[PDB]
Amino acid sequence: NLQDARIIIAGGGIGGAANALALAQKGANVTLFERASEFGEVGAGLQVGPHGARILDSWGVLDDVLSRAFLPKNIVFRDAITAEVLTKIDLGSEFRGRYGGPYFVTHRSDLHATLVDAARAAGAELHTGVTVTDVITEGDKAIVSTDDGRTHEADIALGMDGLKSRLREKISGDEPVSSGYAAYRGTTPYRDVEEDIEDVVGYIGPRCHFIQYPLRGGEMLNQVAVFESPGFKNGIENWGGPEELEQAYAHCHENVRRGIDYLWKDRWWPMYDREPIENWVDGRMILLGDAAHPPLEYLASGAVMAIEDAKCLADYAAEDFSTGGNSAWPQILKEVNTERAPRCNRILTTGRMWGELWHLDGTARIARNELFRTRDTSSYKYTDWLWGYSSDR
Amino acid sequence: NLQDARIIIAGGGIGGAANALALAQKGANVTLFERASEFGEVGAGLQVGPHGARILDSWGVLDDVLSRAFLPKNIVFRDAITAEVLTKIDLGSEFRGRYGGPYFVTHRSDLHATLVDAARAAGAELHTGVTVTDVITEGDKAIVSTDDGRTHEADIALGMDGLKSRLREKISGDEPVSSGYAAYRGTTPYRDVEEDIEDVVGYIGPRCHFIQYPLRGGEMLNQVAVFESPGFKNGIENWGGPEELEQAYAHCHENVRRGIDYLWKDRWWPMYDREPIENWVDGRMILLGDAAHPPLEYLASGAVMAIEDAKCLADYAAEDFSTGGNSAWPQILKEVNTERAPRCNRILTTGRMWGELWHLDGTARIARNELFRTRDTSSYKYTDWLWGYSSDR
Numbered sequence: 001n002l003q004d005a006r007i008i009i010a011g012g013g014i015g016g017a018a019n020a021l022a023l024a025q026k027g028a029n030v031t032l033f034e035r036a037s038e039f040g041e042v043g044a045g046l047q048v049g050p051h052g053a054r055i056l057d058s059w060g061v062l063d064d065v066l067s068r069a070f071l072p073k074n075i076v077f078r079d080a081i082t083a084e085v086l087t088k089i090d091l092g093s094e095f096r097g098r099y100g101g102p103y104f105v106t107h108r109s110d111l112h113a114t115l116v117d118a119a120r121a122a123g124a125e126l127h128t129g130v131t132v133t134d135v136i137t138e139g140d141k142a143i144v145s146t147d148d149g150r151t152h153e154a155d156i157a158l159g160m161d162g163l164k165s166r167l168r169e170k171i172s173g174d175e176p177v178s179s180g181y182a183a184y185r186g187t188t189p190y191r192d193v194e195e196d197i198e199d200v201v202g203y204i205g206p207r208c209h210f211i212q213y214p215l216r217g218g219e220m221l222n223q224v225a226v227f228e229s230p231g232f233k234n235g236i237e238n239w240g241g242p243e244e245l246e247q248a249y250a251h252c253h254e255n256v257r258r259g260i261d262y263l264w265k266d267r268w269w270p271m272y273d274r275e276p277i278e279n280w281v282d283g284r285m286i287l288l289g290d291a292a293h294p295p296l297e298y299l300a301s302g303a304v305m306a307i308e309d310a311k312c313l314a315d316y317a318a319e320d321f322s323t324g325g326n327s328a329w330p331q332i333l334k335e336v337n338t339e340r341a342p343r344c345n346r347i348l349t350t351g352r353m354w355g356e357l358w359h360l361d362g363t364a365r366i367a368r369n370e371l372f373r374t375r376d377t378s379s380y381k382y383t384d385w386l387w388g389y390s391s392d393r
Numbered sequence: 394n395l396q397d398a399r400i401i402i403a404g405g406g407i408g409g410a411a412n413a414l415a416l417a418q419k420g421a422n423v424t425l426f427e428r429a430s431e432f433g434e435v436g437a438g439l440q441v442g443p444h445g446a447r448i449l450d451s452w453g454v455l456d457d458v459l460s461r462a463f464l465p466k467n468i469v470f471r472d473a474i475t476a477e478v479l480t481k482i483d484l485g486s487e488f489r490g491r492y493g494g495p496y497f498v499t500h501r502s503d504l505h506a507t508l509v510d511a512a513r514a515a516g517a518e519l520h521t522g523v524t525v526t527d528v529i530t531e532g533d534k535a536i537v538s539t540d541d542g543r544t545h546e547a548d549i550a551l552g553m554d555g556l557k558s559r560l561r562e563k564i565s566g567d568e569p570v571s572s573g574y575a576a577y578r579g580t581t582p583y584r585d586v587e588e589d590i591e592d593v594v595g596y597i598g599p600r601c602h603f604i605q606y607p608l609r610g611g612e613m614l615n616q617v618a619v620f621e622s623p624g625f626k627n628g629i630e631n632w633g634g635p636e637e638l639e640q641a642y643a644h645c646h647e648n649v650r651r652g653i654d655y656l657w658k659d660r661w662w663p664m665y666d667r668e669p670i671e672n673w674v675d676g677r678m679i680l681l682g683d684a685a686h687p688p689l690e691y692l693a694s695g696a697v698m699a700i701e702d703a704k705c706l707a708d709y710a711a712e713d714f715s716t717g718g719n720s721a722w723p724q725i726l727k728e729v730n731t732e733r734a735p736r737c738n739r740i741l742t743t744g745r746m747w748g749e750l751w752h753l754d755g756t757a758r759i760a761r762n763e764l765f766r767t768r769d770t771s772s773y774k775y776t777d778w779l780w781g782y783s784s785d786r
């Protein structure tokens with residue numbers, strides 16, 4: 001275990017909170033700096049497959065999380081134009097048996113608050129309203145600077161400052177790559193939404209998709225609309241605005257079009273990712289979460305990847321640190337990097353392809369529809385790589 | 394039977410020859426006018442599925458045709474970039490059992506000469522070097538004008554003057570619609586072509602395909618390359634020239650690229666079709682063959698459709714004419730039109746989609762490839778509509 005280790009975490013999102021919890025459960029001294037003045041996430045849904053569920057259970061927080069979550073029966077793909085079901089992924093007991101946990105959906109804010117509170121309970125020292133302005137390595141320590149003039153010493157630091165990470169600049173000059181798709185969200189009271197839904201339902205169509213699922217044991221309905229923005233292709237800086245919505249879904253089924261009216265219009269998420277990179281480490285600093293591997297939303301695994309990052313790091317560290325102390329941190333970081341890069345980078349890359357597959361038109365959509373419909377649903381070859389992965393060695 | 398009937402056929406291609414044979418076998422008086430000074434087709438291959446094979450057998454000419462033909466074992470689809478097999482259609486005995494004939498390939502010129510000779514043997518009067526310049530209906534007869542100043546009387550006339558039919562102008566002002574794909578052909582001695590091929594092999598790729606099959610009992614190899622012409626999209630009148638070939642296949646596998654060198658470069662077929670039409674009849678004139686339903690090459694059924702046209706017409710006429718004589722011709726023509734239009738027009742329309750499916754790129758090609766690979770090969774749902782059709786009533 002990590003009793004003698006000091007780790008500093010720049011960033012307090014799902015990633016940084018998950019890592020605080022994982023490490024402090026191992027007895028490490030953890031200090032986390034979050035820029036925002038309170039901890040919080042959007043009060044909208046996210047999806048957490050069994051690859052994340054499992055890990056939350058090993059942390060002892062899954063039951064509590066499930067008590068405020070929803071357990072869908074299936075993932076259902078529908079054609080966005082005809083509303084016709086193309087296929088289902090069964091989330092029943094064979095699925096739970098094989099992957100070792102439920103696929104569930106919950107409020108981001110609830111999941112985030114659960115991890116913060118459990119990190120706090122495990123002994124992690126968390127600080128809001130504090131921006132990390134620099135990390136360098138000197139001798140065998142990470143030196144972290146904060147925007148109040150202080151510097152802090154630790155054995156390693158974790159750069160978990162998200163998609164627009166400034167700590168990533170130590171390792172790479174790349175910029176975010178726009179997919180040209182904008183994402184809108186909504187949460188409505190179930191009853192108020194205009195039949196019944198017990199699943200994650202994804203309507204896929206040319207240049208768009210529309211996702212729905214219940215939350216809080218059937219009481220809320222989350223809705224997400226993602227569409228290709230004409231404005232991005234014409235050079236607009238603040239592209240994807242709400243005026244584009246109606247024209248974006250005009251070709252789609254009524255079920256999809258009714259859905260548009262429940263969305264929040266005062267805020268949206270233009271969708272970026274980054275080209276995959278191999279190396280995430282700089283001396284005694286490692287990038288994790290969106291800072292190292294920000295994906296497009298299609299595999300619903302960005303936050304799950306950060307959760308995996310946390311487990312892997314804590315597991316690899318607790319194994320190696322017991323015997324070689326502070327001196328072993330760089331080898332540990334490297335080994336975490338080697339395990340995590342291939343896995344996460346395939347998600348980045350396959351996520352782009354999967355997304356493109358949702359958005360086909362013309363003859364390509366006919367082929368796509370028929371491919372989904374005629375598949376062997378007992379086979380797990382499209383999904384084992386994603387849901388069946390573990391970092392255990 | 395049709396002993397008392399006089400039919401005039403404008404056009405002497407596979408269509409018009411097939412119709413001469415069908416009708417003269419029923420005892421009709423047949424006169425055919427062909428514009429070219431000799432009968433002949435290109436000395437290159439075509440494909441004749443069981444939907445045409447069957448009919449040739451009922452005419453008594455299939456055995457003779459088969460003695461100069463090739464019988465492939467399969468239709469094999471390969472990815473034009475990787476050369477990887479995507480799927481096969483088995484042409485074995487289950488296939489022959491179900492559809493009632495072989496799928497075969499032969500020289501167009503051989504098939505054409507066989508039908509001409511058998512039409513001649515059945516009593517059809519054939520005339521080369523004679524252009525039909527007009528057909529009108531008067532009272533209960535078709536009056537046909539020829540480019541030597543003569544007019545000719547018959548009970549009906551068949552307009553089988555091909556893709557660029559001028560008789561079609563009596564019924565419709567439409568023009569040929571360019572697909573923007575150009576087709577090149579080649580026939581090489583089998584041995585001289587650079588492993589072994591016993592099938593129809595179709596390499597499908599972005600913006601192109603390349604088809605191969607043996608002829609004359611394994612002695613020749615037919616090769617066909619079809620590619621999207623950059624020149625068509627830029628407004629060139631005589632588009633699809635041979636200079637475009639190399640760039641068109643540069644992205645493809647070596648097997649495909651070696652293939653390009655065997656093609657005839659001094660002649661090519663830019664590919665046109667026409668929007669489907671319902672009505673083919675004008676008084677006592679019916680359009681048949683390419684004049685009524687010219688397809689793109691993808692289902693390999695243009696000439697087969699003309700062969701079906703012949704059978705249907707002769708069968709429907711011999712049934713109805715025995716009892717109501719010359720007076721029944723318009724009702725006969727209408728009934729042939731009603732049987733044949735839905736069938737042929739679905740071929741026109743599905744042929745476009747099938748073609749587009751061959752030419753996908755990007756993620757769409759990945760979906761397409763996987764769709765071909767994972768299909769139930771024992772199922773016949775993609776093919777019954779095409780190969781299992783009969784006009785028998």
Ligand SMILES: Cc1cc2nc3c(=O)[nH]c(=O)nc-3n(C[C@H](O)[C@H](O)[C@H](O)COP(=O)(O)OP(=O)(O)OC[C@H]3O[C@@H](n4cnc5c(N)ncnc54)[C@H](O)[C@@H]3O)c2cc1C
Nearest residue numbers: 011013014015035047132161162289290300301302303304
């Ligand atoms: C529309 C949409 C839907 C999604 N759905 C899903 C889903 O269903 N399932 C799923 O698993 N994933 C999903 N994701 C991905 C997921 O939201 C992210 O991958 C995940 O939140 C990344 O977490 P993170 O902690 O690495 O980074 P972030 O969550 O971006 O948090 C980084 C934190 O660091 C703070 N920060 C920044 N700079 C500094 C600094 N210098 N010092 C201190 N703090 C700093 C920020 O304030 C922020 O709180 C989705 C993403 C989007 C856009």
Ligand SMILES: Cc1cc2nc3c(=O)[nH]c(=O)nc-3n(C[C@H](O)[C@H](O)[C@H](O)COP(=O)(O)OP(=O)(O)OC[C@H]3O[C@@H](n4cnc5c(N)ncnc54)[C@H](O)[C@@H]3O)c2cc1C
Nearest residue numbers: 404406407408428440525554555682683693694695696697
């Ligand atoms: C590259 C390519 C590959 C193909 N492969 C296949 C295949 O594999 N299988 C298949 O089944 N089909 C195939 N086809 C389709 C097939 O070639 C045609 O559909 C078929 O030949 C049409 O026959 P037709 O007799 O109706 O018309 P045409 O064959 O065009 O013949 C019409 C005839 O009428 C004559 N004519 C024109 N005007 C007059 C007039 N005023 N008076 C007298 N005569 C006139 C012309 O000289 C011509 O001989 C292919 C086509 C192409 C372009």
